[PDB]
Amino acid sequence: LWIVDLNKSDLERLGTSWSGSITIGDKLGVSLNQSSISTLDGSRFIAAVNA
Amino acid sequence: LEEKKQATVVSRPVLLTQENVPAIFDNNRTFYTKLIGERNVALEHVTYGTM
């Protein structure tokens, strides 16, 4: 009997995804994408690229 | 945030017998995919069963 296998796969990943927060005058805090201000006050918004 | 997801998968088993006799086929491969990172290391995998 003859077992035989062939496998073939390719995959690509590209793009960014952003997060983080800003602050204005200790009066208002704007956050992007679930960044809690209760852990960060002056840490400005970051990014992440995958390639 | 917004996105558009679309995926297809088409699979087929083949098998033969004689007439008036039973037969069984079953199969399960595990498909891996490359999570981004080699020292920051992790995997994820899905088994795909058929009977």
From Swiss-Prot, chain A:
Query: Origin, by domain of life?
Result: Bacteria
The record's comment on protein family reads: Belongs to the bacterial secretin family. T3SS SctC subfamily.
Q: What phenotype is described for loss of this gene?
A: Insertion mutants are hypoinvasive in the HEp-2 cell assay.
Q: Where in the cell is it found?
A: Cell outer membrane
Q: To which species is this protein native? A: Salmonella typhimurium (strain LT2 / SGSC1412 / ATCC 700720)
Gene, per the UniProt record: sctC1
Report the protein name in the record.
SPI-1 type 3 secretion system secretin
Query: What subunit structure does UniProt give?
Result: The core secretion machinery of the T3SS is composed of approximately 20 different proteins, including cytoplasmic components, a base, an export apparatus and a needle. This subunit is part of the base, which anchors the injectisome in the bacterial cell envelope. Forms a stable homooligomeric complex. The complex is composed of 15 subunits.
What is this protein's function? Component of the type III secretion system (T3SS), also called injectisome, which is used to inject bacterial effector proteins into eukaryotic host cells. Forms a ring-shaped multimeric structure with an apparent central pore in the outer membrane.
